[PDB]
Amino acid sequence: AAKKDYYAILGVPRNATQEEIKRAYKRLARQYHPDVNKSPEAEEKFKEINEAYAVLSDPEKRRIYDTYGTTEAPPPPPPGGYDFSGFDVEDFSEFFQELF
Protein backbone atom coordinates (compact mmCIF):
# COMPACT_ATOMS: atom_id res chain seq x y z
CA ALA A 1 0.00 0.00 0.00
CA ALA A 2 2.62 2.58 1.08
CA LYS A 3 4.89 4.04 -1.63
CA LYS A 4 8.12 2.02 -1.87
CA ASP A 5 11.34 3.98 -2.39
CA TYR A 6 12.85 2.49 -5.50
CA TYR A 7 15.53 5.19 -5.64
CA ALA A 8 16.89 4.07 -2.24
CA ILE A 9 16.93 0.44 -3.41
CA LEU A 10 19.24 1.38 -6.32
CA GLY A 11 21.19 4.04 -4.34
CA VAL A 12 20.47 6.99 -6.62
CA PRO A 13 18.82 10.36 -6.18
CA ARG A 14 15.24 10.97 -7.30
CA ASN A 15 16.59 13.15 -10.11
CA ALA A 16 18.95 10.47 -11.47
CA THR A 17 19.25 9.96 -15.18
CA GLN A 18 18.18 6.71 -16.83
CA GLU A 19 21.89 6.07 -17.53
CA GLU A 20 22.68 6.50 -13.82
CA ILE A 21 19.81 4.14 -12.97
CA LYS A 22 21.17 1.59 -15.45
CA ARG A 23 24.71 1.78 -14.06
CA ALA A 24 23.47 1.51 -10.43
CA TYR A 25 21.40 -1.56 -11.33
CA LYS A 26 24.34 -3.17 -13.15
CA ARG A 27 26.59 -2.61 -10.08
CA LEU A 28 24.04 -4.35 -7.88
CA ALA A 29 23.24 -7.11 -10.39
CA ARG A 30 26.96 -7.96 -10.56
CA GLN A 31 26.72 -8.68 -6.80
CA TYR A 32 23.30 -10.33 -6.32
CA HIS A 33 22.55 -12.16 -9.64
CA PRO A 34 21.57 -15.85 -9.07
CA ASP A 35 24.53 -17.51 -10.82
CA VAL A 36 27.20 -15.25 -9.23
CA ASN A 37 25.64 -15.28 -5.73
CA LYS A 38 23.66 -18.37 -4.69
CA SER A 39 22.74 -17.10 -1.19
CA PRO A 40 19.10 -16.69 -0.06
CA GLU A 41 19.97 -13.13 1.02
CA ALA A 42 21.07 -12.41 -2.55
CA GLU A 43 17.80 -13.80 -3.97
CA GLU A 44 15.61 -11.59 -1.76
CA LYS A 45 17.69 -8.43 -2.34
CA PHE A 46 17.85 -8.98 -6.11
CA LYS A 47 14.05 -9.36 -6.19
CA GLU A 48 13.77 -5.88 -4.67
CA ILE A 49 16.40 -4.50 -7.01
CA ASN A 50 14.68 -5.95 -10.08
CA GLU A 51 11.28 -4.50 -9.15
CA ALA A 52 12.94 -1.13 -8.56
CA TYR A 53 14.64 -1.36 -11.96
CA ALA A 54 11.46 -2.52 -13.70
CA VAL A 55 9.78 0.68 -12.55
CA LEU A 56 12.64 3.17 -12.83
CA SER A 57 14.31 2.01 -16.06
CA ASP A 58 11.29 2.80 -18.26
CA PRO A 59 10.85 6.57 -18.21
CA GLU A 60 7.09 6.35 -18.84
CA LYS A 61 6.53 3.96 -15.93
CA ARG A 62 8.89 6.07 -13.79
CA ARG A 63 6.66 9.07 -14.37
CA ILE A 64 3.63 7.16 -13.06
CA TYR A 65 5.63 6.17 -10.01
CA ASP A 66 6.95 9.69 -9.42
CA THR A 67 3.41 11.18 -9.57
CA TYR A 68 2.03 8.67 -7.08
CA GLY A 69 1.08 10.25 -3.75
CA THR A 70 1.20 13.80 -5.10
CA THR A 71 -1.64 16.29 -5.26
CA GLU A 72 -1.57 16.05 -9.10
CA ALA A 73 -4.53 14.18 -10.65
CA PRO A 74 -3.48 10.76 -11.88
CA PRO A 75 -3.61 9.74 -15.55
CA PRO A 76 -6.17 7.03 -16.42
CA PRO A 77 -4.35 3.77 -17.23
CA PRO A 78 -3.40 3.44 -20.93
CA PRO A 79 -5.04 1.05 -23.44
CA GLY A 80 -3.93 -2.59 -23.05
CA GLY A 81 -2.15 -1.94 -19.73
CA TYR A 82 1.60 -1.80 -19.01
CA ASP A 83 4.46 -3.91 -20.41
CA PHE A 84 7.12 -5.38 -18.11
CA SER A 85 8.84 -7.75 -20.54
CA GLY A 86 11.99 -9.30 -19.07
CA PHE A 87 10.77 -8.98 -15.46
CA ASP A 88 9.28 -11.44 -12.93
CA VAL A 89 6.23 -9.24 -12.34
CA GLU A 90 3.76 -11.78 -10.93
CA ASP A 91 5.96 -12.01 -7.79
CA PHE A 92 6.36 -8.22 -7.28
CA SER A 93 5.11 -6.32 -4.22
CA GLU A 94 1.52 -5.31 -3.54
CA PHE A 95 2.57 -1.67 -3.99
CA PHE A 96 3.73 -2.52 -7.53
CA GLN A 97 0.55 -4.45 -8.34
CA GLU A 98 -1.54 -1.52 -7.07
CA LEU A 99 0.49 1.14 -8.90
CA PHE A 100 0.36 -0.69 -12.26
Domain 1-100 CATH superfamily: DnaJ domain (1.10.287.110)
Phi, psi torsion values for 50, nearest 5 degrees: -65, -40
Q: What is the DSSP string of the chain?
A: -----HHHHHT--TT--HHHHHHHHHHHHHHH-TTT---HHHHHHHHHHHHHHHHHTSHHHHHHHHHTTSSSPPPPPPTT----TTS-GGGS-HHHHHH-
Q: Write down the domain spans for the chain.
A: 1-100
Helices 18-32 & 40-56 angle (0-180, nearest 10): 170
Q: How many CB atoms lie within 10 A of CB 16?
A: 17
CA 34 to CA 49: how far, in whole Å?
A: 13
CA 37 to CA 68: how far, in whole Å?
A: 34
Experimental method: X-ray
Note the resolution in Å, 1 decimal.
1.6
Largest pairwise CA distance in the chain = 43
